[PDB]
Amino acid sequence: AMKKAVLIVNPSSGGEKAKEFETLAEEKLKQLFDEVVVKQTEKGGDAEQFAREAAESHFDSVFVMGGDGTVNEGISGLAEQAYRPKFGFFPLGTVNDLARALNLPMDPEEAIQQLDLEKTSALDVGKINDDYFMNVVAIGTIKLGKLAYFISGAKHLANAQTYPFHLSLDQKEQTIESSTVLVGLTNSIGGFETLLPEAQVDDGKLHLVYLKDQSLWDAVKAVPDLLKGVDQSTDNLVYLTFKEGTISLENQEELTTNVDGDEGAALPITLKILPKHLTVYCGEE
Amino acid sequence: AMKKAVLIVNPSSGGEKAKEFETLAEEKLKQLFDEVVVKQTEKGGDAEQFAREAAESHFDSVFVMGGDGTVNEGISGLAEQAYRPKFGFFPLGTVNDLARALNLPMDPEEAIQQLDLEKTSALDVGKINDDYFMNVVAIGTIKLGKLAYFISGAKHLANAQTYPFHLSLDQKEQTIESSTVLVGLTNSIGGFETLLPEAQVDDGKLHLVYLKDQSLWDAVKAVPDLLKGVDQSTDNLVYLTFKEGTISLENQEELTTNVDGDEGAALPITLKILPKHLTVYCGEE
Numbered sequence: 307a308m309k310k311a312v313l314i315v316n317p318s319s320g321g322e323k324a325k326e327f328e329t330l331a332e333e334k335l336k337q338l339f340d341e342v343v344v345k346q347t348e349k350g351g352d353a354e355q356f357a358r359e360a361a362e363s364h365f366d367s368v369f370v371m372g373g374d375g376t377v378n379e380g381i382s383g384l385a386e387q388a389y390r391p392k393f394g395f396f397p398l399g400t401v402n403d404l405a406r407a408l409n410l411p412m413d414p415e416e417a418i419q420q421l422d423l424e425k426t427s428a429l430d431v432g433k434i435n436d437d438y439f440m441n442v443v444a445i446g447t448i449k450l451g452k453l454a455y456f457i458s459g460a461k462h463l464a465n466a467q468t469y470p471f472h473l474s475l476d477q478k479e480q481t482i483e484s485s486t487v488l489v490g491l492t493n494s495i496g497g498f499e500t501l502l503p504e505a506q507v508d509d510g511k512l513h514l515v516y517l518k519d520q521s522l523w524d525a526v527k528a529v530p531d532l533l534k535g536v537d538q539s540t541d542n543l544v545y546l547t548f549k550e551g552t553i554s555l556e557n558q559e560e561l562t563t564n565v566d567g568d569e570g571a572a573l574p575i576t577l578k579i580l581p582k583h584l585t586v587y588c589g590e591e
Numbered sequence: 592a593m594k595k596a597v598l599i600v601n602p603s604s605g606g607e608k609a610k611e612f613e614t615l616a617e618e619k620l621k622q623l624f625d626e627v628v629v630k631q632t633e634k635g636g637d638a639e640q641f642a643r644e645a646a647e648s649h650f651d652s653v654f655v656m657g658g659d660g661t662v663n664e665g666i667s668g669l670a671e672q673a674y675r676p677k678f679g680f681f682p683l684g685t686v687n688d689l690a691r692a693l694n695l696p697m698d699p700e701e702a703i704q705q706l707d708l709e710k711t712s713a714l715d716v717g718k719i720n721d722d723y724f725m726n727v728v729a730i731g732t733i734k735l736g737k738l739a740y741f742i743s744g745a746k747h748l749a750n751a752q753t754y755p756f757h758l759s760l761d762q763k764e765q766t767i768e769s770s771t772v773l774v775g776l777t778n779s780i781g782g783f784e785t786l787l788p789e790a791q792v793d794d795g796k797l798h799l800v801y802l803k804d805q806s807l808w809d810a811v812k813a814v815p816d817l818l819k820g821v822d823q824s825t826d827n828l829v830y831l832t833f834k835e836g837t838i839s840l841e842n843q844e845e846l847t848t849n850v851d852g853d854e855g856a857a858l859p860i861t862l863k864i865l866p867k868h869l870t871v872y873c874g875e876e
């Protein structure tokens with residue numbers, strides 16, 4: 307009947323004129339929708355709750371104005387609902403990986419301006435145990451000028467323990483020893499747009515990378531591979547894709563994942579792709 | 592006649608109980624010296640001025656309580672003075688490269704406790720044009736967890752322009768193309784104690800390292816070399832020692848150096864070793 311949209315705003319996202327961006331977005335949506343409900347997040351979980359309530363109320367569309375944290379929550383609130391509103395977002399964050407993957411303008415005002423209800427794309431969603439992810443599941447990752455970044459960073463690989471991971475992926479079984487495992491959905495992770503160049507938002511796959519490091523010396527050698535973009539296995543890392551899989555430890559230890567930048571489920575974890583799960587408003591590319 | 596010492600204190604160095612460290616140092620020095628003058632720095636240059644005035648007054652010893660900035664200034668105030676007081680210091684800084692090189696205790700209280708006027712070492716001092724350095728002259732250097740350090744750092748090599756440097760070292764001439772040149776006095780630079788493992792505080796040499804990078808890809812490949820400690824030239828970097836030399840640009844551009852963590856002289860620069868220039872109180876190693 308009446309086309310309705312909710313606009314979920316994280317006021318802590320963005321900078322000084324973020325409030326002005328909210329006004330632009332609201333007046334733009336009011337041109338497109340008969341009714342626009344504006345909801346402001348106050349704490350963790352709010353965006354997820356708002357998005358879910360919008361789905362239960364059969365709203366036409368759900369829009370998020372915030373960073374990746376708020377976008378994840380919003381998508382989490384929609385995921386596997388019997389009816390799912392179309393999803394849109396206006397990036398206010400410092401990174402905005404999903405925006406990059408969908409070729410949205412980095413500039414919020416431009417993103418609002420170029421919103422086209424006709425311009426959509428299917429969007430895979432990740433599932434990890436009982437939760438959802440939209441960008442990445444990371445395992446085991448947490449005077450000299452430009453050189454200091456290595457002496458701090460290339461070192462901090464040493465601080466990274468190796469684990470006996472077992473990977474059960476699409477009914478293929480293997481045990482590895484590694485300090486670092488990443489599972490991504492799109493080409494962009496942490497603002498590095500070329501990390502997974504072959505990954506597409508609707509290719510229906512999870513993309514896994516792990517380092518073949520045992521020493522601090524093999525981990526360091528993987529760094530140029532990551533910079534070039536991971537599209538194949540090398541001497542220093544392995545690249546795999548899968549639809550469904552379980553990652554566990556062969557010597558069970560309390561190991562917690564990092565999911566879209568936040569502490570997530572502990573191992574073991576079962577990861578699944580939800581292919582073409584959402585309809586998202588995208589760029590004109 | 593009467594043994595006199597000055598204690599130069601940077602109150603902005605160190606943390607909460609730094610004031611208490613000053614008291615311990617003062618009462619320790621009063622056991623060792625008939626007179627102790629305590630001077631507190633307020634701005635850049637003060638430590639250098641205090642140290643120089645102590646030399647002109649023929650004080651027996653000069654002590655610095657602070658970080659590398661204050662130690663550099665103190666040493667700069669003594670350098671090439673006709674009479675030079677013996678030099679000591681109590682590390683309060685976050686890095687303290689010189690302390691590491693002399694095997695002083697990291698802990699200030701322990702450093703004060705173990706001060707032995709009989710335990711000394713000769714100390715080379717560096718000269719760059721009209722100024723002095725004690726650690727390093729650097730040229731051209733200024734969600735994913737531990738991986739982000741590279742994606743930030745391994746990238747930031749790209750932001751590093753290459754320059755056509757000319758090196759005139761001990762009457763040997765060569766032109767190189769590089770983004771990064773480092774000239775050090777000791778084994779420790781920026782808190783990385785194994786960077787120049789063969790350098791000794793009194794070996795009478797300046798130690799030069801430059802990256803053989805033209806691309807972002809050769810610079811990255813130099814990183815494991817640096818981590819292992821530079822004791823030889825490799826496919827990715829060159830290691831040289833010299834006593835006197837001039838570094839210039841073949842296409843003159845405004846390029847400023849970084850000297851012991853602070854902006855220093857612009858190219859061209861003439862670097863010289865002042866071998867065994869100071870007597871410094873050292874560790875029991």
Ligand SMILES: Nc1ncnc2c1ncn2[C@@H]1O[C@H](COP(=O)(O)O)[C@@H](O)[C@H]1O
Binds near residue numbers: 347348349376377
């Ligand atoms: N009103 C608010 N004030 C402060 N922080 C908030 C607010 N609403 C959400 N957050 C937090 O902001 C983070 C998400 O921000 P972002 O990653 O920019 O979307 C989460 O940790 C939320 O708990």
Ligand SMILES: Nc1ncnc2c1ncn2[C@@H]1O[C@H](COP(=O)(O)O)[C@@H](O)[C@H]1O
Binds near residue numbers: 605636657659661662
């Ligand atoms: N009283 C003071 N208050 C604030 N900063 C100071 C003071 N005295 C010296 N400094 C600065 O502290 C720096 C040196 O600190 P450090 O590297 O810890 O020895 C230099 O930039 C000085 O200008």
